[PDB]
């Protein structure tokens, strides 16, 4: 990259109708249960999950990398207890992008104790362009975006030791 700068786009506390709190001990900080730092896990608030919306019009003068995710539960029980509803959907749209994802509820082998999964997707939001998040559940929202620039590409090297 020529330039890479992490900026806040959809602040954690902007969701007044949902629960920004939440995580598991599979992702643990100081023994306490936690979650991905730059991500927000939207659950139900007041025993109700009204459709969560969010948008960001890009003005940082650069192209922006934005990452989101959806939750694939292990069973109907966690689907109901967390997002209050079944038959939910996650919708992300920009000028170029139109992507819709659904929760896939099924029992899977345990990885870090969980049978559930979190599937992430990403995009490059152009300058002066808006992004639109819209979900009735299972959305794992970005709190941050990444300004980016490229003069050209490179590679990834495995060494195990010492930059001099």
């Amino acid at each position: 990259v020529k330039h890479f700068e992490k900026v806040k786009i959809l602040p954690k506390d902007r969701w007044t109708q949902h629960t920004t709190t939440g995580g598991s001990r599979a992702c643990a900080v100081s023994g306490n249960p936690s979650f991905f730092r730059n991500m927000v896990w939207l659950t139900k608030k007041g025993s109700d999950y009204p459709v969560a919306k969010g948008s960001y019009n890009n003005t940082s003068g650069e192209q922006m990398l934005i990452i989101w995710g959806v939750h694939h539960p292990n069973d109907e029980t966690e689907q109901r207890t967390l997002y209050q509803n079944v038959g939910t959907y996650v919708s992300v749209g920009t000028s170029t992008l139109n992507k819709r994802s659904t929760p896939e509820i099924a029992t899977r082998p345990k990885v870090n104790g969980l049978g559930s999964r979190m599937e992430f997707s990403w995009t490059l939001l152009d300058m002066w362009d808006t992004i639109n998040f819209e979900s009735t559940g299972n959305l794992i929202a970005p709190e941050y975006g990444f300004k980016i620039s490229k003069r050209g590409s490179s590679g990834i090297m495995k060494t195990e030791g010492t930059l001099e």
Epitope: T21, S24, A26, P33, T43, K45, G46, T77, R80, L82
Partner: antibody, heavy 112, light 109 residues
Framework: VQLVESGADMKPPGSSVKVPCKAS????????ITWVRQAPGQGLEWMGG????????NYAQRFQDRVIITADESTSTAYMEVSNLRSEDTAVYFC??????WGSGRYYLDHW | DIQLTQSPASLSVSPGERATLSCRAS??????LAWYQQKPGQAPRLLIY???TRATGIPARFSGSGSGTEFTLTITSLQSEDFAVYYC??????????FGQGTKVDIKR
Amino acid sequence: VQLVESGADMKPPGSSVKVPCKASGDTFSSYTITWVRQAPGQGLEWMGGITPIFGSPNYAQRFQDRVIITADESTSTAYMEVSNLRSEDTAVYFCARVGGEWGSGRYYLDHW
Amino acid sequence: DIQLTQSPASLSVSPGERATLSCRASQSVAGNLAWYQQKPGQAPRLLIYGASTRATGIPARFSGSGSGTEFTLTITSLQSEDFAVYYCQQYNNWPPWTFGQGTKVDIKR
């Protein structure tokens, strides 16, 4: 792990109770406290449950709106409050914990 | 709306006569079934979960078995503390906290 609660409560009909449930041991509080009820001589019945991180607790169809469940993660204690009692509400109120961690599929009650 | 019925309601078995209990569900709860032991005047103790594997601190007389609609609980040689009430809990269909009425085991004479 020890879930310890208050014992022996005596209340008039039309009054409210609040049964505390303190969690001693290794407190995760990403784990779900479940409230179960047992009328004298009868079986067990799920009243609801709460997971402190996620907030927003569940209630069974029967005890919905007749009861409310809260939690203080700072005191490691979960409360089951019965608004407006009746003579038929005389029973034992257990607080249990589950295998925990939504997505594990282990929703048995391992502690009491 | 899973229905859980335990038969027999009461079981009469001698100390060491190998008591066997049975829980049956209206639909298939697959491999997810638990067994609890409640001794009179006390809270339930977790015995079996996943229909087969047994909880921590539980002696090996207690053996779970079965899958689908019909399950089973086995106690090889009974004991003093083993005369109580036993419940089965399904956990497949929401809500996963439906219970069975229970089976009461007493001393056969």
